[PDB]
């Protein structure tokens, strides 16, 4: 089971430095190289570079020679991508991928990097209940609203994961240095007025967890 | 003495500089060789090793084994690019590479001039020199890589002389290669000059081996 | 660099048909009869997934309906037939010369159902009205195509500020889109009006679909 796991998100003010990780598992770290790619949604992909995990010699693209480096840990099996200084550019996800056949096969977890002087803000959870009907639908729609948090991401589940069907999570929209996103779940009308439906939110940046029960109106 | 133990590789890929064939013995005085075997029978590029058994019985009863850079990449091939001569059939950590003891020259820009290098053996020992003659598969792989359809290689020495020539032909698929690449070797006596002369298809030496025997 | 290209940006292919993506490199990404051309699939929120390499060999575990062809500077990606899980974005990348370069990327769209959205409106919760604000939410789920817009009516009068629209990508098993429109107002601005109405405009309806509540 080949695994390439990357450290969680990182929020740093412009001008500091970052040390992203990539842990090799399920295969021999040596005998294979590590690629790094920069993903900015809509802007496509860009090839950062490549590091020969045996010879230890790196090769970078022209747009990264200077502020980007590759370091290895071979005793332990980890690869690092260090960025400095962080202009508010390079605002994008970073993937560590493996060399196999002059391509990339097992891409990594993903490390969303954010570069802003703003402050960590835990979210405020708001339950969204219907509160009115006309016996016109055997299916009702609930909602969980997360507003005014920073930075990304948030993990929204229903009843700790037991409610997976009919679940929609809309991507966040940034406004005034704070993100707002909403989620929905669709279950029948017989279990809702009787069985407890709880929204579960986790903001890993502030280490805050809030559970909100949906109460009818 | 004690036999030489190679790791992951036979004598073919070991002394050819095959990547992924890095022995760790660091012994410079072995008697005979013991080779761990695998799929790329040393030659990660489909080919034939000429006078192999003659080379096996040479790399035996060794009492010295200095490896030097006969043709320094950075200061030997101005008219031809030493880079770019790598394929996915000889990888190094999932990335196309090539033998670390041979350089695969291809045309620089759109020209492959007539190269001519010479080593005169300032070493006081027999020097093992290895090279390779690429045999493309198509008449277009030739022009695209060497630009000259009427190419030739000529390795010459006091002890050895032989004019080479491409053998363009579609060979059966082996490691996604329809071409071939034979490898050769010779012993340059102390004080002798080994000449190289080619206008294409020469996989040129980079590292040789001074050695004594018995 | 060896810049690749995009052809076409997006294409809507019906289920069971043949979706062809082709990308052309400025330089020849071939050498020794070997083409260093690769194809990747990236579903949203997931890392790119290797499909084909070099430039026709299928990666172990990839369905057979994927097939890549080409040589020199003209390559193609063939999906035969097209499923619903194939809704993602496809990139073409070379490895002939440094630096490696990615293509413009092709986002595939599945066409079926031509359905209308499911609308649900939610009033401001009690917890948010304590914080001095009020956000009214309207959800649009399971609709196709993605082209749609929302108008907010407060007591019959239109409003366009504090509007935070957020589309989802194409559903993996449903091939439908979803949208969420957030209307944010202060607590005092929310308590002086009574009728709140969000109405959408979709091609599957000549008149706007209305969903409202009264405070
Ligand atoms: C590898 O070499 C052995 C002899 O050493 C030969 O019999 C075998 O056929 C070679 N490998 C292949 C794939 O032919």
Author numbering:
A (entry chain H): 1 to 217
B (entry chain A): 56 to 269
C (entry chain L): 1 to 215
Lines from the paper:
Most broadly neutralizing antibodies (bnAbs) recognize hemagglutinin (HA), the major surface glycoprotein on influenza viruses. HA mediates virus attachment to the host cell through the receptor-binding site (RBS) on the globular head region of HA1. Here, we describe a chimeric monoclonal antibody, C12H5, that offers neutralization against seasonal and pandemic H1N1 viruses, and cross-protection against some H5N1 viruses. Through structural analyses, we show that C12H5 engages hemagglutinin (HA), the major surface glycoprotein on influenza, at a distinct epitope overlapping the receptor binding site and covering the 140-loop.
